[PDB]
Design a protein around this ligand. Structure first.
Ligand SMILES: [Zn+2]
Lengths: 123, 72
């Protein structure tokens, strides 16, 4: 592979946007985990709610679903797509996201391969 | 003819304002120190409302808000 590990999530998130396979927010993520239609989850390390982190971690662990950590919620939301593009091209309007669930993968081999390799290396 | 106003009725009928609840997901689950998760709210027996659609713990009944199913 050529793409970096941390920068390879953008392709998957964009393709899940295009194919409508994203559960955004804690309520939708928890509902998807209970429905166990989830494939993987994305968690934001920077947050002010320890109960949020505990609930997401326990739901991911007890449903044998892999979890990914992200630096901050604003970058996570910018990846997710809850932003508007200015004339120059920067996202002045960003709404942070603390948890994301990928319900359907995008039909991209390169994007999935690196994430699967990282998950296998973690295990 | 010209329209008469006649503006006098019950002073103001107010519109229902929905309650703002912060982090309503958390109260559905209880957590032990070992890391276990227990679902406080019952799960509806309907087809669509089977896993993540919890019911309502009213003082004398159980109510699913997604399909109006009610139990004692
Ligand atoms: Zn129901």
């Amino acid at each position: 592979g050529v793409m970096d590990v941390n920068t390879a999530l953008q392709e998957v998130l964009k393709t899940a946007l295009i194919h409508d396979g994203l559960a955004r927010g804690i309520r939708e993520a928890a509902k998807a985990l209970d429905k166990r239609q989830a494939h993987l989850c994305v968690l934001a390390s920077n947050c002010d709610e320890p109960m949020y982190v505990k609930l997401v971690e326990a739901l991911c662990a007890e449903h044998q679903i892999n979890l990914i950590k992200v630096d901050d919620n604003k970058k996570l939301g910018e990846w997710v797509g809850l932003c508007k593009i200015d004339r120059e091209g920067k996202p002045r309007k960003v709404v942070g996201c603390s948890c994301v669930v990928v319900k359907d993968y995008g039909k991209e081999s390169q994007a999935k391969d690196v994430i699967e390799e990282y998950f296998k290396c973690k295990k | 003819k010209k329209r008469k106003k006649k503006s006098c009725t019950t002073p103001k009928k107010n519109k229902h304002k929905r309650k703002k609840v912060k982090l309503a997901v958390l109260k559905y689950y209880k957590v032990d120190e070992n890391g276990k998760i227990s679902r406080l709210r019952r799960e509806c027996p309907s087809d669509e409302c089977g896993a993540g659609v919890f019911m309502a713990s009213h003082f004398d009944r159980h109510y699913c808000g997604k399909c109006c199913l009610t139990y004692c």
